[PDB]
Curated annotation (Swiss-Prot):
Weakly expressed in heart, brain and placenta but not in other tissues. Expressed in a number of cell lines, predominantly in those from colorectal carcinomas. Residues 8-46 form the UBA domain. Disulfide bonds: none annotated. Interacts with isoform p14ARF of CDKN2A which strongly inhibits HUWE1 ubiquitin ligase activity. Interacts with MYCN, POLB and CDC6. Interacts with isoform 2 of PA2G4. Interacts with NR1D1. Interacts with AMBRA1. Interacts with HAPSTR1. Interacts with HAPSTR2. In hepatocytes, interacts with PAQR3; the interaction promotes PPARA poylubiquitination and STUB1-mediated degradation. Phosphorylated on tyrosine; phosphorylation is probably required for its ability to inhibit TP53 transactivation. It is linked to Intellectual developmental disorder, X-linked, syndromic, Turner type: An X-linked neurodevelopmental disorder with highly variable clinical manifestations. Common features consist of moderate to profound intellectual disability, delayed or absent speech, short stature with small hands and feet, and non-specific but recurrent dysmorphic facial features such as macrocephaly, microcephaly, a broad nasal tip, deep set eyes, epicanthic folds, short palpebral fissures and a short philtrum. Patients may manifest other features, such as hypotonia, seizures and delayed bone age. This is E3 ubiquitin-protein ligase HUWE1. Transmembrane segments: none annotated. The HECT domain mediates inhibition of the transcriptional activity of p53. Belongs to the UPL family. TOM1/PTR1 subfamily. E3 ubiquitin-protein ligase which mediates ubiquitination and subsequent proteasomal degradation of target proteins. Regulates apoptosis by catalyzing the polyubiquitination and degradation of MCL1. Mediates monoubiquitination of DNA polymerase beta (POLB) at 'Lys-41', 'Lys-61' and 'Lys-81', thereby playing a role in base-excision repair. Also ubiquitinates the p53/TP53 tumor suppressor and core histones including H1, H2A, H2B, H3 and H4. Ubiquitinates MFN2 to negatively regulate mitochondrial fusion in response to decreased stearoylation of TFRC. It is found in: Cytoplasm; Nucleus; Mitochondrion. It comes from Homo sapiens (Human).
Length: 47
């Protein structure tokens, strides 16, 4: 059947969110960014 990825990704989201962040930034982070690493930075730049 049909399957793939839609919108952001919980993985990264949760992954980061776990580190101790806010879903708000987390989400935007990913959205803004593209890869996981990038996400980290975004968050790392917004504690």
């Amino acid at each position: 059947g049909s399957s793939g990825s839609s919108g952001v990704n919980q993985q990264q989201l949760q992954q980061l969110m776990d580190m101790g962040f806010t879903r708000e930034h987390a989400m935007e982070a990913l959205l803004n960014t593209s890869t996981m690493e990038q996400a980290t930075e975004y968050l790392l730049t917004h504690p």
